[PDB]
Amino acid sequence: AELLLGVNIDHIATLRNARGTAYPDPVQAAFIAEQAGADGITVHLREDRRHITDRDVRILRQTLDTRMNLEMAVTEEMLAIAVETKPHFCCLVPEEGGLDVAGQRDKMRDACKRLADAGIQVSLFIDADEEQIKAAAEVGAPFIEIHTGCYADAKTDAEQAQELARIAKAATFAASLGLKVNAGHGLTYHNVKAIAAIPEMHELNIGHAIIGRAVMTGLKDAVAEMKRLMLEARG
Amino acid sequence: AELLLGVNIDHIATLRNARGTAYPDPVQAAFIAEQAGADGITVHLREDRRHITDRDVRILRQTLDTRMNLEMAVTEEMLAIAVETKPHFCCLVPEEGGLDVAGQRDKMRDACKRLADAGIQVSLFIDADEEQIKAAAEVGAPFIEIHTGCYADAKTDAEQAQELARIAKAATFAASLGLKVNAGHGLTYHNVKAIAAIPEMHELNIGHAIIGRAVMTGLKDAVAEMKRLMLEARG
Amino acid sequence: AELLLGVNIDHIATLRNARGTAYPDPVQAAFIAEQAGADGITVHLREDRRHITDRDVRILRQTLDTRMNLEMAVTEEMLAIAVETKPHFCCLVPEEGGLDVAGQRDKMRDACKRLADAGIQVSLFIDADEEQIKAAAEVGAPFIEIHTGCYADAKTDAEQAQELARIAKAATFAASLGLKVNAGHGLTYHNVKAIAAIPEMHELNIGHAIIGRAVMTGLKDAVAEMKRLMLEARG
Amino acid sequence: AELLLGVNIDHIATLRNARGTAYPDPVQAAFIAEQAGADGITVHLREDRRHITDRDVRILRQTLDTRMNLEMAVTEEMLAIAVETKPHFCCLVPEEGGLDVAGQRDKMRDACKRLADAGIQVSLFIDADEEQIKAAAEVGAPFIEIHTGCYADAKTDAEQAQELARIAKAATFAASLGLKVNAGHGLTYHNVKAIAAIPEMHELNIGHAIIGRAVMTGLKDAVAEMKRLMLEARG
Amino acid sequence: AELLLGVNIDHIATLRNARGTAYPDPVQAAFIAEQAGADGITVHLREDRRHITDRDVRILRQTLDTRMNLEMAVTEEMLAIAVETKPHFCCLVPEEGGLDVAGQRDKMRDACKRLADAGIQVSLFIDADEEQIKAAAEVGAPFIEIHTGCYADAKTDAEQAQELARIAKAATFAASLGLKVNAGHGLTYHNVKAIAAIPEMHELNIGHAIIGRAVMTGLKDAVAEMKRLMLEARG
Amino acid sequence: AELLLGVNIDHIATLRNARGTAYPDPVQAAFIAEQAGADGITVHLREDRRHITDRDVRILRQTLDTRMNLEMAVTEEMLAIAVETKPHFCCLVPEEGGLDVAGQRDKMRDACKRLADAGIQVSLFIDADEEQIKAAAEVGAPFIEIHTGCYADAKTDAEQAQELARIAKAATFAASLGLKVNAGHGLTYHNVKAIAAIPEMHELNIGHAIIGRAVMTGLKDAVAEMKRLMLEARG
Amino acid sequence: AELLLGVNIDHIATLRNARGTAYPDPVQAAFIAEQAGADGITVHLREDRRHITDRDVRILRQTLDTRMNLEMAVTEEMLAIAVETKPHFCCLVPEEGGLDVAGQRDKMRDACKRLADAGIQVSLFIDADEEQIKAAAEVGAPFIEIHTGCYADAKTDAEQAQELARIAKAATFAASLGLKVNAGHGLTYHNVKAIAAIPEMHELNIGHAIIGRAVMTGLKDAVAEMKRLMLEARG
Amino acid sequence: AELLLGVNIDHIATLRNARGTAYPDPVQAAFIAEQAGADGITVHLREDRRHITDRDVRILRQTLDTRMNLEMAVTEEMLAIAVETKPHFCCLVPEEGGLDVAGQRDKMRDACKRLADAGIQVSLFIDADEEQIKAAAEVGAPFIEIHTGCYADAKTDAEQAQELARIAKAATFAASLGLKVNAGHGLTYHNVKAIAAIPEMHELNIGHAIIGRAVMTGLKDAVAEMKRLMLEARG
Ligand SMILES: [O][C][C]([C]OP([O])([O])=O)O1O[C]1[C]([O])[C]OP([O])([O])=O
Ligand SMILES: [O][C][C]([C]OP([O])([O])=O)O1O[C]1[C]([O])[C]OP([O])([O])=O
Ligand SMILES: O=P(O)(O)OC[C@H](O)CO
Ligand SMILES: O=P(O)(O)OC[C@H](O)CO
Ligand SMILES: O=P(O)(O)OC[C@H](O)CO
Ligand SMILES: O=P(O)(O)OC[C@H](O)CO
Ligand SMILES: O=P(O)(O)OC[C@H](O)CO
Ligand SMILES: O=P(O)(O)OC[C@H](O)CO
């Protein structure tokens, strides 16, 4: 099918949480994004409940029209929450910045096993690294989300093209191991296309850039604009 | 009789500083607000730098088309900066929430004279309390800014009409002492009008609610809506 | 203060329940309306749960930024739900169509006390009849909502003028007894002005006409349009 | 040629009949839809006249700029009305939900001939079943509309993929028999693409999802959005 | 109440009739105007059916949400059509340009009598002339519509102020005879206010200027703009 | 391979000339169209002056930012004007609807040479008939403009695919004789694509439908929509 | 009565002339301004034809829907042009910054008389100086336009209050001598209200600020916004 | 890969500098352009500081989200500024119209090397002339920018085809020498596609036409439109 867009609305909550008022509400942003180009909504439940809260998660789970992508660390608390929330997806992240799967195979194998028993499709957030990618496939996870952070932070064009190739190459290798592959982190309006051009990419999860544009332009257009650039890249 | 709107763009920066990238940029937010109903732009330069930064204040001072209202604590560092920056207005704030002017008549006295000698119109952020208002007049400040936080937080409709009355008496009282009076903090699209209808009010400084509405509808309509409400209330 | 607009979103649910699907969602509609001129949101929980469901009320109670006006019949079931929900307002209606308070003073008296003990401000939905009005005051309700239905179905400009005059006198009589007075049912973009011009009116509750304009122009402009016509009438 | 979009406005009427009032009017909705991406308008005249009424069909027949697709059951009443109305298209449906043509070849054969003699191009609403499809061709209908309902209610990505594949094969089988093939029922902004990508599809008939998006964003953008997603899938 | 706006949509049909196609359709324009500021819709059935047709009139009569104002000459054919159409209003015009009432008293008396028997409220289109105005009241018509043509065509400011005074003065005199008074003809975006400022004016019927703006801007805004200028003039 | 759009603003003038005032002004309509997708502006200067006038042509010639396509009959008056005006293009039209070039090979021969000596690119408006096409090539005209009226008026879907094919063969035929080919007259938002997909087509001249859509949505979106459809068809 | 807005479009030409191209065309800008709040259009025909040119004036004189206000220096060349051009208004300006009328009583006396015989209403651009105003009344000019530049360039809020007062006194003074008074030049979104609130003001002529806003928001909104601010001030 | 759009905002400053005010501010225009399709921003720092100034450059260098392309003449002053400024790109221009690189091989060779040590990518603005291109490759510049002015100013369609071809051949030629090639200057909405379709093109730098469109439609749409046209050309 076509490249999917998962909108991370965490930053809506970081705006809210800077004051303890109820606005802006992530429940509203999710309706907007879902109707402006988002194919899924991503939330990251942090232990410190810095932005997204259990309240958001519980309501979002009842209001989303598409599917929730629960981002969380691999800890007993979160696994239990994930198990009871039954989100359609679960992206496991760290408590170059990606999860260390190669070095924690048993831990990761049990988490994937456990989340899948609860009928959740698991995605492991890792670096564009073949060792981590091979390990991901071996612990049994169906998805991986390639960290696009270093590509985004590239300081020169050389650094960027090098990072792009590492990512594209990583995606091809992962697909060959039968993994389905996503990307996200640091993606912006001016750097998303080269990543969206990568054929193996299944869905891009984008947050900060979108919210940063929304304050100026409104969430609806901010999301539609991102989706448009993404589909353009594939055309 | 013409109520002015001062938009506080602090939270544009909080959203940016949650990531370390350059966006969203407060300088862009100011251009938008100034052209959608804002008569002034307010930025609070906190010691910790959390949201608004020195760079922000430096560029803003050269990009604003209206005038700057520097929110700061009364310290030597800040007073130093203010005199260097020469913002049109300076609003003294602590770091019931309002400044304790009566309990520091000399520090405030010198603070005002100093900023006043720099060509800065000083405003003392205080509570709707006559003792403080008398202090501010005695101390020489041209302006005071009545804290509307307790009115915004009033749980019941009764506790609210209660705080409204206190703010209304405090504004008429301030005006009788020759003080020009502003109000800010906690004002929302839903509680602003009652405050705007208060005759003595010179300018309402508003930030969080506007930014909060902005991520949904975009800063321009968010600012324009607030100004429209304010003028309707006066009419 | 400003004439308020309460938006009834029951018909968003009507459109939803015709299919079993989850869209359109009353929770979304409420966010839009509250940010486009609505000062309150109104839902009618019907015993047959035709449109608004227990889920809607449960989620809405957690997502509304303003306040809820729960429309319900006077039955043990509903009263129990109201007490548990703690809506800000409760509008009691029948299961010309107004409540027969004068003929059930005991029942209504117990209902008002009970809800009032739960912190709920009660409104009695009644016809423009001074007997019913006098009784509503006597039973202890702080509010009443005059039934504007007959005025809306006026088949002749004359029947209309006559119905208007009757609401207006009723409103004035209501206010003299100390009641805050609302009005709603059948109000449209073409007949709202004459009712909004009535000074004693506190809040108009409008549903159908707005949703009917929304399927064409979208909810936001539909609510804003209505608020604007309402404030023009007061001006 | 271009994949066409037929917009079903039944639910505009649903919202209307909940009150006895005349708004919203299906006649207006049709003009908006035809000018925003709709290539045809679809109404279902139900024997109970739940939503669309004889008036609507009568006026619509005179105001549509494109062509009407009259959805009706195969009864003497409806057939008589169809013949008198001379709609461009007629979609026969039941009073998984598709018509049992294979089991009523005589009835359907007479129905098709009769309507065809009236100049009406007939479409048989059927399940993605080759027996029914084979029979539709044999009874003489120039069109069929595959029931996309089961595909829409797919509870698992798997049930969905399986339902899709089944529609696709059915479509290809339909085309080989010389049938023009349409599809509709339950299509949404999130599942329309996979169906629009099916080459043999001539026109998709979509109702509810569009009206559901309309109460939020207004009909025009709701229809345009849908057409756009449809042409992107073909591209 | 407030100054009403009657939108004449004749020119929509003159655009249509220049080609014999069905677009643009007056039925659509009427829905738009009615929802953008129009309080009534005006159509002029000319004997030659130059623009508006009997078809338009018959449909419009079933689709208008507000009220039809049938403009027509005082001839047996039209009276019969008026009698069967039962529009809410009927403006009698000539087959300085206004109807000659003073010189055809019997004719006019019978037409008013006849139309009123059919329950139609009659308006006579006349010059800002006291003789014609007195005659209008005497033949029994409830409304008069003052020809604003000469005010519109004024070639100098003197000519315009003179025409304005003749109109204002005419309106005061008519009101004193108990007539309700409208105006229209030649009203534009730059000359409507001075006419809308006249207190006696009940409704302004405007056509050409609105349609002329619509081609550039869209009917909706063209109507909302006119209504806004009109209410501004009265404020 | 890049299809151009030529907007005919004739009907802007017909709307104006229905009143004798200056609005709507064709000169404004041209500025809008040229900036919303039009690559050229067409005006037909009729002997009777009905819509477009000499003033129009004179100012348009100085205001157009693209180029003029003067539609005219082959007469001495018109040919005289054309040579004086020096429009970029000249489209010869009579006053099946197309020019009879074969039956006037000499008049047309001289007409072309004359206009061609003035620096005018000549186009002969003709029917999708090979005899005429051969005549136009023989006569020296650089362009021909295939009449799409019969295709636009085709009642049945069959009579339509019939006319499409004739136009498609006539365009490929024209191209083989070295003629550049345009098409115009009757094209609407709903029949344009099939015509735009024809490879040989250089520019489609379109007027009435655009103006007709313009009174509803405004000229800018009306022109932009048409261009968008045209390019989608080519893609 | 109505405070009028004259839009000066010189800077559209300024932008054009910076490249020798034809765009942007002042003629287009005038259509936009006249339909967005401008009651008049002003162009300054400088002797050096820096921005506005003779074709601009010539064409504009034929396309303006309202009326032209010709700014020009007093020289025979200009008087001949003005006289031949017959603009509705003429504002004599020097080529503080005001026209030295006192110092050239003879020249202006002849200018005013000469322009008046031509039916041109004359306005003298002067400083808020009694000497110049007496002089302007003595010479016979019907209007004066007070130079608000000093008010616009006022640094401090005091320096500015002095300037406002000076303009208001001068306005009152001018009126007492039978002069009608306009203002403008340097007026902006943030400083226009204080001037519009001056009751003697008949029309404010504004250019630069509007054009500067237009490059960001587009001319239509920039003009509507200015007109809105002005009307707000007088109400 | 992706064809890029560099927006030249010099004319924003041109409009500003025409009045000594601070608006419109180039800094605001850059934020708008970068969020509407611009991949870069170009400013020409003229030795006479006619439009863009040193503060503009200084602030822009701190606010641009993408990257700056500094246009400048080759002089020590400029080289020092460029070097100290560290813009991502530098386009050396003369102060046909192209830079005479052949005639000054020494000067440019030092310029290129000097700018490159500073980490600045250098582009030489030249005519589509092989001599100059060879010269540009010999001196070591990594980019060239072909002057499209002659193509833009091409009167006849022939004169224009010659120019296009010349640019395309020069583009192909330049590429064969290892040069990357940009184009721009004089590019407009109506002539940009033919240039964007040239495969060797890396970035088109456009200014004037966009700003000229912006005064009418606002910058955002003017930029988005240009980017859209460009991508359309390459697809
Ligand atoms: O999901 C995905 C996302 C993306 O984002 P961006 O940045 O790219 O947009 O992500 O993950 C992440 C999150 O978690 C972040 O959060 P914070 O908020 O913490 O930063
Ligand atoms: O009704 C009213 C109207 C008005 O118009 P205006 O112009 O003002 O707009 O009217 O009456 C008349 C009509 O009839 C006219 O028509 P036509 O079309 O014929 O011209
Ligand atoms: O509106 P607030 O609550 O965000 O804060 C206002 C600022 O403190 C400015 O004074
Ligand atoms: O406006 P209505 O007729 O839909 O109904 C209003 C509700 O009954 C009040 O909430
Ligand atoms: O899209 P639906 O589910 O509302 O229904 C489609 C209609 O049945 C077809 O016209
Ligand atoms: O599109 P039409 O039917 O209005 O006419 C097109 C014009 O005749 C231009 O060639
Ligand atoms: O508003 P300004 O400063 O651009 O100039 C206005 C013109 O002088 C017109 O009066
Ligand atoms: O598009 P232009 O003609 O305004 O100029 C473009 C600049 O020279 C930037 O390259």
DSSP assignments along B144-210, one per residue = EEEE-HHHHH--SHHHHHHHHHHHHHHHHHHHHTT-EEEEESS--TTTHHHHHT-TTEEEEEE-HHH
Shortest alpha-carbon distance between residue E3 and chain F (Å): 25
Q: Is residue B147 annotated as a catalytic residue, yes or no?
A: no
Nearby residues of H106 by Cβ (< 8 Å), 6 or more positions away: none
Distance, CA of H31 to CA of H28 (rounded, Å)? 5
Question: C203 - beta bridge partners?
Answer: C4
Tell me how far apart the terminal alpha carbons of chain G are, to the nearest angstrom: 11
Q: For residue A69, give the 3-state DSSP assignment.
A: strand
Burial-class residue G84 by CB neighbours within 10 Å (0-12, 13-18, 19+).
exposed
Q: Among B145, B147, B163, B185, which one carries the catalytic annotation?
A: B185
Closest-CA residue, ligand 1 atom 13, reads: A44
Distance, CA of G6 to CA of E232 (rounded, Å)? 19
Distance, CA of A185 to CA of A204 (rounded, Å)? 9
Closest to A41 (Cα-Cα) out of E123, A50, A52, C132: A52
Identify each DSSP E strand in chain D by its residue range.
4-8, 40-44, 68-73, 89-93, 121-126, 143-147, 180-184, 201-206
- 8 Å CB contact between G124 and G105: no
- 8 Å CB contact between H87 and H120: yes
Annotated binding-site ranges of B for 3-amino-2-oxopropyl phosphate: 8, 19, 186, 207-208
Please tell me which residue of chain F has the smallest CA distance to H233: F2
- 8 Å CB contact between F5 and F37: yes
Please tell me which residue of chain A has the smallest CA distance to H67: A190
Q: Among E34, E145, E185, E200, which one carries the catalytic annotation?
A: E185
HEC secondary structure over F49-97? CCCCCHHHHHHHHHHCCCCEEEEECCCHHHHHHHHHHCCCEEEECCCCC
Determine the residue among F31, F56, F58 to mutate to test chain G binding: the one whose Cβ has the most chain G Cβ atoms within 10 Å. F31
Ligand minimally distant from the alpha carbon of residue C70: 4
Query: What DSSP string describes chain B?
Result: ---EEEEE-HHHHHHHTTTTSSPSPHHHHHHHHHTTT-SEEEEE--TT-SSS-HHHHHHHHHH-SS-EEEEE-SSHHHHHHHHHH--SEEEE-----S---GGGHHHHHHHHHHHHHTTPEEEEEE-S-HHHHHHHHHHT-SEEEEE-HHHHH--SHHHHHHHHHHHHHHHHHHHHTT-EEEEESS--TTTHHHHHT-TTEEEEEE-HHHHHHHHHH-HHHHHHHHHHHHHHHH-
Ligand minimally distant from the alpha carbon of residue F16: 2
Q: Looking at chain E, how many residues does it have? A: 235
Residue type, C120: I
- CA H125, chain centre distance (Å): 8
Tokens of C1: 């203060």
Q: Looking at chain B, how many residues does it have? A: 235
Q: Which residues of G touch E158 (CB under 8 A)?
A: none
Tokens 């590429």 map to which residue?
Answer: H175
Query: What DSSP string describes A34-66?
Result: HTTT-SEEEEE--TT-SSS-HHHHHHHHHH-SS
User: Which member of C193, C213, C216 has the closest CB to residue E2?
Assistant: C193
Burial-class residue E171 by CB neighbours within 10 Å (0-12, 13-18, 19+).
buried
User: Which member of A190, A194, A235 has the closest CB to residue H39?
Assistant: A190
Å resolution of this model?
Answer: 2.3
Annotated binding-site residue? D8: yes
Distance, CA of A66 to CA of D15 (rounded, Å)? 25
Question: What is the position in ligand 7's atom list of the atom closest to the CA of G208?
Answer: 4
Partners of chain G (3+ Cβ pairs below 8 A): B, E, F, H
Asked if B63's CB is within 8 angstroms of H59's CB, the reply is yes
Q: Looking at chain F, how many residues does it have? A: 235
Ligand minimally distant from the alpha carbon of residue D69: 5
Note the CATH number of domain F1-235.
3.20.20.70
Distance, CA of G149 to CA of G152 (rounded, Å)? 5
Give the residue numbers of H marked as catalytic: 44, 71, 185
Shortest alpha-carbon distance between residue B18 and chain G (Å): 29
Tokens of C220: 């936001």
Tokens 């929302």 map to which residue?
Answer: B188
Query: What DSSP string describes A93-143?
Result: E----S---GGGHHHHHHHHHHHHHTTPEEEEEE-S-HHHHHHHHHTT-SE
Q: Residue A201 carries which DSSP code? A: E
Query: What DSSP string describes E49-106?
Result: -SSS-HHHHHHHHHH-SS-EEEEEESSHHHHHHHHHH--SEEEEE----S---GGGHH
Residue type, D170: A
Distance, CA of B85 to CA of B61 (rounded, Å)? 7
> To test the ligand 4 pocket, which listed residue (C187, C192, C202) has its Cβ within 8 A of the most ligand atoms?
C187
- 8 Å CB contact between D24 and C215: yes
- 8 Å CB contact between G184 and G5: no
Q: In chain C, where are the structural domains located? A: 1-235
Tokens of C89: 């307002």
Question: What is the position in ligand 4's atom list of the atom closest to the CA of C187?
Answer: 1
Q: Is residue E44 annotated as a catalytic residue, yes or no?
A: yes
The finding on whether G207 has its CB within 6 A of some atom of ligand 7 is: yes
Nearby residues of A91 by Cβ (< 8 Å), 6 or more positions away: A42, A69, A70, A71, A72, A123, A124, A125, A145, A205
The finding on whether B148 has its CB within 6 A of some atom of ligand 3 is: no
- Binning chain F into helix, strand and coil, the percentages to the nearest 5 are 50, 15, 30
Q: What is the dihedral of CA G52, G55, G58, G64, to 10 degrees?
A: -60
Protein residues with CB under 6 Å of any ligand 1 atom: A 8, 10-11, 42, 44, 51, 71, 184-187, 205-209
Q: For residue F5, give the 3-state DSSP assignment.
A: strand
Distance, CA of B149 to CA of B96 (rounded, Å)? 9
User: Which member of G1, G34, G231 has the closest CB to residue E232?
Assistant: G231
Give residue E7 CA to ligand 2 midpoint distance, Å: 9
Q: What angle do CA E151, E153, E157 make, to 5 degrees?
A: 65
Shortest alpha-carbon distance between residue C46 and chain E (Å): 30
> Touch between chain D and chain E (3+ CB pairs, < 8 Å)?
yes
Distance, CA of H164 to CA of H143 (rounded, Å)? 20
Asked if G221's CB is within 8 angstroms of H219's CB, the reply is no
Give residue A213 CA to ligand 1 midpoint distance, Å: 15
Distance, CA of H63 to CA of B24 (rounded, Å)? 11
Identify each DSSP E strand in chain H by its residue range.
4-8, 40-44, 68-72, 89-92, 121-126, 143-147, 180-184, 201-206
User: Which member of H157, H213, H233 has the closest CB to residue F35?
Assistant: H213
- 8 Å CB contact between G150 and G165: no
Q: Do the strands A40-44 and A4-8 form a parallel or antiparallel pair, or are they unpaired?
A: parallel
Q: For residue D6, give the 3-state DSSP assignment.
A: strand
Annotated binding-site ranges of C for 3-amino-2-oxopropyl phosphate: 8, 19, 186, 207-208
User: Which member of B35, B39, B66 has the closest CB to residue G216?
Assistant: B35
Determine the residue among H9, H16, H27 to mutate to test chain B binding: the one whose Cβ has the most chain B Cβ atoms within 10 Å. H27
Shortest alpha-carbon distance between residue E28 and chain D (Å): 6
Ligand minimally distant from the alpha carbon of residue G89: 7
